């Protein structure tokens, strides 16, 4: 009967389909500490410094 | 007579034809859950997840 494949077809395709998701998840991860991080040490470089009184 | 055998080999004919339509109905309800749950916990994964405040 097709039934059966049918069935067994659809368990794989919904696994692939975690797994692709999965990637989108954790690359996202790794992107924020790296922007947040870019963005607050940069802003300091620029704010900050040193002037000769006399 | 030639319709003593004829009556007989078709209570066999059927009986064989009754296992082989038992294993598919057995098969298919043993496929049905696990195809279920499959989804079902694949889903709750990807949308699920927590975040950090500060």
Redesign the interface.
């Given at each position: 009967?097709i039934?059966?494949g049918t069935?067994?077809i659809?368990?794989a395709m919904?696994?692939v389909?975690?797994v692709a998701?999965?990637v989108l998840?954790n690359t996202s991860g790794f992107l924020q500490q790296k922007a947040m991080a870019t963005g607050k040490e940069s802003t300091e470089q620029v704010a900050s410094g040193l002037q000769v009184i006399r």
């Amino acid at each position: 009967a097709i039934g059966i494949g049918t069935l067994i077809i659809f368990i794989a395709m919904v696994l692939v389909a975690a797994v692709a998701a999965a990637v989108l998840i954790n690359t996202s991860g790794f992107l924020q500490q790296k922007a947040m991080a870019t963005g607050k040490e940069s802003t300091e470089q620029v704010a900050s410094g040193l002037q000769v009184i006399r």
